[PDB]
């Protein structure tokens, strides 16, 4: 019962240091079987060794209160523990470009989990250098098998959108010189990379884009998120910088409402994401039903990246009040981008 991961390739290969990405959503699997699950790829490009490394996660779970009498009042509690997760989409600084120059692929997965079962979404980032040979590949992830299928679009360097090619150009200067351009909705997949520094003051710019009261930005997370718009000229370091907002208009990602609906809201909750904090630092909403959306997030109000794994809980991703903060690790959706095409 193999599943397919389609990849689109333009006619012209290697105009630049560009990479393509594909994804596939897998059927639910037991949560216990996702431990130590790593992709085993059969492509001609060896997977990056840093993806299979151990990344320490905080597991936040919800359960009915253990104390009798209070358990009779159907209240629920939160438990925070440290776990080790491998193969998750935790990229490092300049990993995409180094993988491009090293002919190495980046195969990671995003997991959508309720309290007991997980829906994994496998991602693969490969350079366009594999778009000329177009050698078929097989990827094994736990009990599932994925066939890497390459499709050759009728575009020189653009991305196929509604039967037409589209090229997004970089910075305002190129648009001004071209003197005319067109904007269309282009699918995009993004990953958050956390890196400490002095030029990575993320939230001082976050407050600038949208009116959010976020004081004491120095103690908050520092980093950028790199997104792939597919095709050629995909890599973007940070969006809306004016050299190359939509993600935060729909922070939850592509519309994935459960819609027959056996989903039951249990109620909101608070929990300690560092598991050693004096008080709760993150708010979540526990739920029951089919797993939906992303169960992984990162606490912003901590310079060091505090990765969050909350099976059966929905992390609070609204930064309107900056309280109980979290941000999605991965985001898939459609954004309108300027550009031009033949």
């Amino acid at each position: 019962n193999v599943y397919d991961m389609k990849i689109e390739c333009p006619h012209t290969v290697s105009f630049g240091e560009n990479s393509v990405i594909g994804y596939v959503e897998l059927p639910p699997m037991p949560l216990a079987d996702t431990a130590q699950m790593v992709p085993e790829s059969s492509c001609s490009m060896d997977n990056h060794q840093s993806i299979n490394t151990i990344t320490k996660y905080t597991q936040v779970i919800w359960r009915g209160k253990a104390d009798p009498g209070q358990s009779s009042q159907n209240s629920f509690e939160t438990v925070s523990t440290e776990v080790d997760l491998k193969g998750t989409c935790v990229l490092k600084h300049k990993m995409v470009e180094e993988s491009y120059r090293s002919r190495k692929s980046i195969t990671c997965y995003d997991l959508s989990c309720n309290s007991t079962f997980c829906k994994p979404t496998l991602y693969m980032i490969v350079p366009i250098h594999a778009c000329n040979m177009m050698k078929s590949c097989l990827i094994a992830l736990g009990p599932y098998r994925v066939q890497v299928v390459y499709e050759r679009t009728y575009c020189m360097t653009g991305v196929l959108i509604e039967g037409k090619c589209f090229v997004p150009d970089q910075s305002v200067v190129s648009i001004i010189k071209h003197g005319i351009f067109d904007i269309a909705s282009v699918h995009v997949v993004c990953f958050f990379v956390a890196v400490k520094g002095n030029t990575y003051k993320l939230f001082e710019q976050v407050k600038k884009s949208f009116e959010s009261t976020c004081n004491d930005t120095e103690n908050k997370v520092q980093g950028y998120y790199i997104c792939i718009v597919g095709g050629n000229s995909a890599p973007i370091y940070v969006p809306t910088l004016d050299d190359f907002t939509g993600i935060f208009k729909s922070p939850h990602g592509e519309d994935h409402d459960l819609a027959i609906a056996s989903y039951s809201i249990v109620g909101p909750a608070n929990a300690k994401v560092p598991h050693s904090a004096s008080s709760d630092t993150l708010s979540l909403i526990a739920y029951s039903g089919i797993p939906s959306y992303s169960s992984l997030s990162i606490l912003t109000s901590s310079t060091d990246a505090k990765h969050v794994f909350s099976p059966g809980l929905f992390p609070k991703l609204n930064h309107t009040n900056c309280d109980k903060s979290a941000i999605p690790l991965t985001w898939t959706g459609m954004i309108d981008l300027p550009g031009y095409y033949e």
Partner: antibody
Amino acid sequence: QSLVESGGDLVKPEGSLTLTCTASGFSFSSTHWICWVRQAPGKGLEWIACIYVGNTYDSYYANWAKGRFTISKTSSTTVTLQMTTLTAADTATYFCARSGSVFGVVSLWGPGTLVTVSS
Amino acid sequence: GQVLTQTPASVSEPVEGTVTIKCQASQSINNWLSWYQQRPGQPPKLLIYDASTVASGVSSRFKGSGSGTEFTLTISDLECADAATYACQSYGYGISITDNSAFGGGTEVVVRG
């Protein structure tokens, strides 16, 4: 708040028996887990199976009881436990368990019922 | 394969004394343990959960300590009503739902008067 176990009569070897657990004056809600635990005279507690007993369905069985036992929720106050091909080693006291998570802390037990497997 | 070892099988301690029950797990559980009191012909009663928290209505004379792979249960100021059977349950959460889920062997407590 209490749990009541019914059934549990004398059953011939290789036979089948279905147990039933009932709740008294308390709705099942959606943040609870119902489980079955058995204990032979002179031996420790043994896990059997659990049910989320909510809107969504998911159940987990013990390794020894997989395929041979059958647990399912029936209504908003009752759960069942079908037992098949019972042997002499299955003669034990079967308890109904209520927990806040799967295979978790049992916040409330029941008096228990005895299943005697003898010819 | 997760195995739960509970020792000693039987213990005999006098009144006003102390009782020590050792519950050791083959696999690490991260301070997830529960202690139960089981009288004959009675449903087991939960007294200690999370290996350190006293359940509401349970006397302070019951103390639970330990973390990781080794836990102990101490009963101070022993009484005649405390003579019962005790067992430990190893419960897991999230990933460890089915990896470490087992019940203790059970210990017999006799109170010498």
